[PDB]
Ligand SMILES: Cc1cc2nc(CCc3nc4ncccn4n3)cc(O)n2n1
Ligand SMILES: [Mg+2]
């Protein structure tokens with residue numbers, strides 16, 4: 488387990504967000520990419536707007552953010568950038584649905600998005616279980632997710648990192664509950680059933696936000712919506728994040744090929760020219776239904792759906808040669 492230096496986190500308190508970014512950041516399609524220096528600062532900003540400059544000890548929060556950064560590997564997609572990008576989507580979702588979630592959920596969810604893909608190796612769940620890592624020998628299903636959460640718990644229990652320490656012991660244990668499901672929910676495998684359920688519940692109108700496991704479901708769906716929001720950005724941003732996703736996929740594939748194994752088309756750099764078709768497949772079978780269902784449960788979230796539709800037709804053009 489790994490911690491941060493005093494220098495780094497003290498550099499975090501001085502930071503103040505450049506005034507031009509205040510309007511732009513509220514936008515769902517906002518892109519954090521041109522502002523690396525500022526990524527940990529932006530998180531702070533978003534928590535500060537989300538629930539005040541005193542929902543957390545300032546000093547104690549900066550420690551955490553920077554340790555979390557320390558525990559993102561220098562991988563091309565599942566890295567510090569994806570952590571924050573995801574966190575920003577959740578921020579915008581909470582900001583647009585002001586009175587739907589409890590203070591506890593709000594903090595809970597922003598913290599879970601930041602740690603969602605913690606200490607990620609660049610390897611899929613399939614890959615680790617398939618052959619035949621110690622991380623898959625501990626956690627059988629949702630292999631990388633459990634690690635992600637475990638990493639999270641550990642960082643919290645470090646020396647004065649425990650941003651949740653002031654709370655009651657039942658609020659503490661409970662925000663951790665909220666955090667856990669959320670992260671686990673980022674396992675794309677689990678998304679399909681979950682969404683299917685919510686779709687049914689909404690159709691019959693049995694969906695109840697007073698129901699605890701309905702909440703958990705809705706939140707899951709929100710996490711998924713957040714994990715995937717490269718697709719919700721402006722086309723030129725979506726393109727480049729696309730290049731980061733495949734770099735990681737193909738390296739995984741390259742490990743399958745180093746042992747004679749055909750990696751499935753997604754992970755196969757020999758299957759480059761099939762990428763646009765892949766994206767369209769993915770928007771249709773995954774992205775669109777995610778945002779469609781979510782927009783339905785939470786109308787204010789619509790701009791995400793709009794932007795997904797926009798990009799999907801761009802891939803079309805790409806495929807059709809234009
Ligand atoms: C933002 C984003 C894009 C994306 N694309 C994928 C894979 C989609 C895909 N491409 C393929 N190419 C060839 C064969 C199959 N596929 N399937 C998985 C993701 O998590 N994301 N996230
Ligand atoms: Mg994950």
Ligand SMILES: [Zn+2]
Pocket residue numbers: 569603604673714
């Ligand atoms: Zn993720």
